[PDB]
Amino acid sequence: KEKARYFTFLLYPESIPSDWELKLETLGVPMAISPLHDKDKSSIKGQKYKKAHYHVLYIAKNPVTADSVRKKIKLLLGEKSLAMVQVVLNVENMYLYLTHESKDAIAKKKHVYDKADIKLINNFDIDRYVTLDVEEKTELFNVVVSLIRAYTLQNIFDLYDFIDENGETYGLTINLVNEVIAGKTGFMKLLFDGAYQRSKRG
Amino acid sequence: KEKARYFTFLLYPESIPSDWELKLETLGVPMAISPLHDKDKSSIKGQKYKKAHYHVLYIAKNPVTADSVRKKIKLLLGEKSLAMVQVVLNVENMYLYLTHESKDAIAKKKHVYDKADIKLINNFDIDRYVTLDVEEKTELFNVVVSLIRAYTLQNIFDLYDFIDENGETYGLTINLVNEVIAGKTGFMKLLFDGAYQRSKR
Amino acid sequence: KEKARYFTFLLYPESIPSDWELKLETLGVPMAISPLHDKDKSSIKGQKYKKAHYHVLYIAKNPVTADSVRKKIKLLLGEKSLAMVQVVLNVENMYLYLTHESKDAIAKKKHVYDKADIKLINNFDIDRYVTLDVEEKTELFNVVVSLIRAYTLQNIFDLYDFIDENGETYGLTINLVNEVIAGKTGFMKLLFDGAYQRSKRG
Amino acid sequence: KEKARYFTFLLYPESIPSDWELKLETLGVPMAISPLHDKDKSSIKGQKYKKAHYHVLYIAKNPVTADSVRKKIKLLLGEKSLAMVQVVLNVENMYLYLTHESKDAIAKKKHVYDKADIKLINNFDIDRYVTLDVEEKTELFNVVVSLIRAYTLQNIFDLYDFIDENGETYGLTINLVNEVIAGKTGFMKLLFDGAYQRSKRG
Amino acid sequence: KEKARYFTFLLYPESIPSDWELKLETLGVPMAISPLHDKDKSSIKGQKYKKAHYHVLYIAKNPVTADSVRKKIKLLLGEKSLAMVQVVLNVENMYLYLTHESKDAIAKKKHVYDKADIKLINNFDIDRYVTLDVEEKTELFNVVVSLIRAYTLQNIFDLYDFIDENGETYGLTINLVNEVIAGKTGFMKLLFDGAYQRSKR
Amino acid sequence: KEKARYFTFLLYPESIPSDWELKLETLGVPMAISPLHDKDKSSIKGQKYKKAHYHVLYIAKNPVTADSVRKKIKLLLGEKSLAMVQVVLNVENMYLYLTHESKDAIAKKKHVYDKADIKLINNFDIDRYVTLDVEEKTELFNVVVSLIRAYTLQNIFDLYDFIDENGETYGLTINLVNEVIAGKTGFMKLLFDGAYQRSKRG
Numbered sequence A, C, D, F: 001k002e003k004a005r006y007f008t009f010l011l012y013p014e015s016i017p018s019d020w021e022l023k024l025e026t027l028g029v030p031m032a033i034s035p036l037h038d039k040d041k042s043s044i045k046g047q048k049y050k051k052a053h054y055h056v057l058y059i060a061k062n063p064v065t066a067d068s069v070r071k072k073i074k075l076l077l078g079e080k081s082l083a084m085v086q087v088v089l090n091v092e093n094m095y096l097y098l099t100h101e102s103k104d105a106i107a108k109k110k111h112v113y114d115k116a117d118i119k120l121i122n123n124f125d126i127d128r129y130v131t132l133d134v135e136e137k138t139e140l141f142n143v144v145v146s147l148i149r150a151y152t153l154q155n156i157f158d159l160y161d162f163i164d165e166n167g168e169t170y171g172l173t174i175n176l177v178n179e180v181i182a183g184k185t186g187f188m189k190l191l192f193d194g195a196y197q198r199s200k201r202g
Numbered sequence B, E: 001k002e003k004a005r006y007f008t009f010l011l012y013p014e015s016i017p018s019d020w021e022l023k024l025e026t027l028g029v030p031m032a033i034s035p036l037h038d039k040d041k042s043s044i045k046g047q048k049y050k051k052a053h054y055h056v057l058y059i060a061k062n063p064v065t066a067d068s069v070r071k072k073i074k075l076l077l078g079e080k081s082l083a084m085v086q087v088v089l090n091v092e093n094m095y096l097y098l099t100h101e102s103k104d105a106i107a108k109k110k111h112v113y114d115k116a117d118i119k120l121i122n123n124f125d126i127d128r129y130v131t132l133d134v135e136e137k138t139e140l141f142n143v144v145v146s147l148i149r150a151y152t153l154q155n156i157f158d159l160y161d162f163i164d165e166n167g168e169t170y171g172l173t174i175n176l177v178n179e180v181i182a183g184k185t186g187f188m189k190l191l192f193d194g195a196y197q198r199s200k201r
């Protein structure tokens, strides 16, 4: 009865309608689908590859429960397309996993698939699910502060422009600055005020 | 044993009272009804269109079974007014399907109807069934930021005007902008300040 | 555990002290007591008229746990004084539902009682509790935004004046505007700023 | 194991040190003590008044549990000065009760004692424990809004001054305005802005 | 079976090592120690003062029994260094009692000692044990409001200066003002605005 | 139910897969694993050396329930993989306590292990988690206030410069100031305003 937003499960071509992809789209939910996993080293006796399958990365809008997600997929594709739906405890790791390009896949030397074969439904983008921890945010925010003093950046445009240029040096991007300074605009306003009247003293 | 909030079914003019619209209101649930579907291409040979039908989007007050809604409207409109009572997994998708403007219907290249011929029963509003996730909100917020920098938008009126013109290009509307910037006005005030004094330089 | 402000439960005359109506008042909470329910057309059909009971509409000062309400009144009016407490999704309904004048009690046609026999403890006043849902609040807020743009309203006085005149056209009132813009003053300030400098451009 | 801030209990002169009052003071906690209840109509056979007693209104700093409050008083005054400590479910009603001047006391016609005999420890003031409900606050806030428009009050001093004069007409005081506009200063700033530029248009 | 956080006991110079202060630090708990009490009036006839003693305010890391602390400091300072080990119900009261400046000690008109002769072990700070309740905070906030109106205080520096002078009259200090106005700066900004434009009229 | 970010629990080699160190990494959470605890001088004195075990210092991204951590790792490393999970009051301690170099393990003299054998998963870095308590934060904030008054510091740049010079005298650093004034920018703005207009008065 746990409730989460990130889920994963398998679909096999053998028990899904041909237009399954367009159907999954009608759910309005964002999804990542693996290249076809058709070259997975099996370890059954005398079997080279596993039964071919897709991995689906599925992110619900609000915390729901695995079972709810399962009945939804069953109703959509047929009661015979789904048995189990794990909750994903690490979206990044599991996104990489789709192409077996994650740390645990790399170490197990699993077959690597093609990024270009991944299917993105409903504007899914992994970039939106990897988000800073609290300490990274603190860390980056302090970097932002030293940038603003170091360069007497008078306002957010000036900061933005500076990031456009020198961003990589400091590990920063436009979107990352936005995530970093969220909830801290009061503090930002102190900084730009400071920068503003400093520049006026020169 | 399966309960749900959102449902859908077909209604046939040929076998419903002529004041059905009104009757469905006695029900006390929101509903969207398609324009009359009288131009759905027929596969049956020698016949251009299917028998005219309405599609009904039905929104129960609390999770109920499909059968309950079957009876509710047989008892309302008569035993032979009801085909294809299904549960609905994405209200917005189905609502757009009433005029064949969902991705899937466009996909199957079905015939487009007039969104104006839709009927809303019991103050049904589609916008009340659709909402952004956190990620979409962050996404759209970043778009709004780039718009503001790209065009040196000095204040929310200028942003609004810009949306009025170019909104569709960027996936934005007035009400969506309002939903996107809620809770972030401090940040907005940082952007307009910057735009303002940039324009002055 | 669910918390809330609006509650309801039943009281059985045969096991509440005879001065109960004054013990309850002792809580400082506003409540609404129903006329005495002596004509509940037997739900089992055991003996025509269902037992002598009351309906209480109870309004916690702060948000609290149902269970806490029981206790509070079990420790107040005796051990088997009250039955099962509900939270209340819709104040207005569970209210009219007190004389069986809710749209469900007439739809289910139930003995219609009298408003007179209603008891209003601690200034309880049904109107005070009629509130906007989240969606209505969003809806009205967007209306307010379009008004402000449409008429270049420069500040809250100008908005207020406009509502005084054309308020009904748009479903608005002074007090409703106040309820709608609560918690959104920052956004309001964005709008008036915009209106202000727009009017200055011509 | 409930946790609350408001408690009450009895002390009888016969089992408390003479300087009990100064001792209760050493607890740092605010307290209201009843005039001596020595004329309480008993209903034991052949007994005119009850054993004389004090009522103590006791408000802890943070939610604690009855038992904790009891052991504290026991350790302070002796294990023989306290048996039970009810949690107070209505401070106002119970404050009045000290002099039997509450609605439930008045109706039971209990002996009325002298306000002047009440003992206030550690700056106890009932005024600080009676606070507005949510709807009263809303109500008063809307009144404040109409005052500000009606009189084009340009800032909080002007509002304050107006309250000094006409406050009673509208049910307002300085401290009450403060309680009403708490958490709403953003809204206040909209109003005064409005008032300010309105006065400039005349 | 009774556990507590705050304790107190007597220590006697005559029967403690001469580096006791240091030893009590090996304990790893905050502590306040009174100045030497060597002027406590004696009721015993022919003797002016009681045998010099220190009062120790002891603050356990977690709720412990009185006996535990008895042993802890017998084992530390020797079996005969320990009288009057009590639990403490109001840390601030006891801390003020170390110099006989609590209400009760003033009440019993006891002898006042020098607050400067107090010793703090393990960075013990009394201000960390004292805090305002919600009601006191509201009270003091209203006082701060009246001060601001009464004196047309235009900004927080002016308020601060005023507190420096007249603070005690109103029960206020710099750090207390800071505790009182936390979370209410928006309101403060309303007051200074008003003061500002009042002074201009 | 208690929520938190810092946690710790033990792992028994004999019932965790042999690639556990890489299953854990799979969680994206930073943790710190102790050198292998093979020398816990038998607490019962049953058989000199206590069973072979590990100590894990685990750092949830968001605040969560202990129980959820178990599950997470029971579903991760097997059913009897881990023992009893503690929340952690002091990060720094339960850390050093990993090689028994906490001030309590030496005070209780316990087998001192080696830092080398420590395992730092997902960039876990003890320093990043050393935080200010509420009291220290209040304390430092008041210091910052007196600095601002004492030197009429007009804005955050001036404060920052002052800290660059005299910071150590007062126990302050750029990053510490940032941590101290977080959530208090409104108050900061009061102070700089005051400093600003003071400097203008002479």
Ligand SMILES: [Cl-]
Binding pocket: A181, A182, A183, A184, A185, B183, B184, B186, B187
């Ligand atoms: Cl933000």
Ligand SMILES: [Cl-]
Binding pocket: B181, B182, B183, B184, B185, C183, C184, C186, C187
């Ligand atoms: Cl907002």
Ligand SMILES: [Cl-]
Binding pocket: C181, C182, C183, C184, C185, D183, D184, D186, D187
């Ligand atoms: Cl508000």
Ligand SMILES: [Cl-]
Binding pocket: D181, D182, D183, D184, D185, E183, E184, E186, E187
């Ligand atoms: Cl406030």
Ligand SMILES: [Cl-]
Binding pocket: E181, E182, E183, E184, E185, F183, F184, F186, F187
């Ligand atoms: Cl603050």
Ligand SMILES: [Cl-]
Binding pocket: A183, A184, A186, A187, F181, F182, F183, F184, F185
């Ligand atoms: Cl901040």
Ligand SMILES: [Mg+2]
Binding pocket: B127, B128, B129, B130, B131, B132
């Ligand atoms: Mg919506």
Ligand SMILES: [Mg+2]
Binding pocket: E127, E128, E129, E130, E131, E132
């Ligand atoms: Mg304190």
Ligand SMILES: [Mn+2]
Binding pocket: A037, A040, A053
């Ligand atoms: Mn696979």
Ligand SMILES: [Mn+2]
Binding pocket: B037, B040, B055
């Ligand atoms: Mn159709």
Ligand SMILES: [Mn+2]
Binding pocket: C037, C040, C053, C055
């Ligand atoms: Mn009834």
Ligand SMILES: [Mn+2]
Binding pocket: D037, D040, D053
């Ligand atoms: Mn009495």
Ligand SMILES: [Mn+2]
Binding pocket: E037, E040, E055
């Ligand atoms: Mn003494």
Ligand SMILES: [Mn+2]
Binding pocket: F037, F040, F053, F055
């Ligand atoms: Mn160990």
